[PDB]
């Protein structure tokens, strides 16, 4: 009756097959599992690549799945995601910086980027207010190529955050990544500008913590789960089932993920 939408973005067939087996064995057939390329709700996206239709890329450190090494840490990493076009078409993150060099008009693209950053900034400040932190950390790659997209990102993110009344501290990519992996307790909320390096940093943090499920906020309004490994996908499915209103099944999947990461399907 109900439907779970599986999105594949750069994920090996093994992970997708594992996710399908897990949901089928745990759900028992009550909720069907359909595959697609875009969704707004009841969706799990498998693979490092960012799907189409997501504007925010928040990720946290769930208490249940905390690795013993990272016990007690509490930091929220939100990556701003610009609208994604077709693979052949030039992405906005690159168009916004190359068209300016070429002299082409960049009004509509700036407007779209501004809207995405405002939404991401609103999500970040809401998380910061909920956690109680006073200052957030902006992350912008300091490469000369990305001298326009980051500039707009800073100009808008700081504007929105200052309007909300919180402080912002700008930093690069290498220093923040090292701090987040080594000393993450000194960062409460970190926003990341839309770059490939930032995406890798988000994945590394999501994996080093012990394997977690990232939350994507879409344009339509909602939250969709995202995973890239067996454990992360299993946690993403468990959260998705919990959202549908299944508690015991979600707990079983979470326990199986904690015990046997790579073979949860057989473990449960």
């Amino acid at each position: 009756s109900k439907q779970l939408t599986f999105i594949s973005a750069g994920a090996t067939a093994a992970v997708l097959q594992s996710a399908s087996a897990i949901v089928s064995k745990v759900a028992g057939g009550r909720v069907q599992t359909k595959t697609a390329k875009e969704a707004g709700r009841h969706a799990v996206v498998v693979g490092p690549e960012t799907p189409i239709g997501v504007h925010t890329a928040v990720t946290e450190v769930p208490k249940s799945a905390q690795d013993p090494l990272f016990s007690g840490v509490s930091t929220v990493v939100v990556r701003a995601v610009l609208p994604r076009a077709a693979p052949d078409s030039v992405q906005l993150r690159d168009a916004l910086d190359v068209y300016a060099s070429a002299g082409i008009d960049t009004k509509e693209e700036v407007r779209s980027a501004t809207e995405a950053f405002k939404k991401s900034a609103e999500v970040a400040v809401g998380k910061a207010k909920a956690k109680g932190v006073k200052r957030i950390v902006l992350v912008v790659k300091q490469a000369s190529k990305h001298n326009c997209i980051n500039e707009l990102f800073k100009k808008i993110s700081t504007e929105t955050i200052e309007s909300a009344g919180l402080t912002t501290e700008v930093v690069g990519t290498a220093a923040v990544a090292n701090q987040l992996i080594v000393n993450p307790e000194s960062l409460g909320v970190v926003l990341l500008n839309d770059v490939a390096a930032t995406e890798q940093i988000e994945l590394a943090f999501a994996g080093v913590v012990g394997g977690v499920s990232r939350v994507y906020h879409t344009v339509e309004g909602g939250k969709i789960s995202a995973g890239h490994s067996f454990k992360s996908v299993a946690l993403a499915v468990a959260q998705e089932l919990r959202e549908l209103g299944l508690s015991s099944e979600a707990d079983k999947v979470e326990a199986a993920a904690s015990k046997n990461p790579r073979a949860v399907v057989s473990a449960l």
Binding site: V90, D94, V98
Partner: peptide, 11 residues
């Protein structure tokens, strides 16, 4: 610029 955009598309 076309060559530069091609490179960026390659990631």
């Amino acid at each position: 610029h076309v060559t530069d955009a091609i490179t960026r598309s390659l990631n």
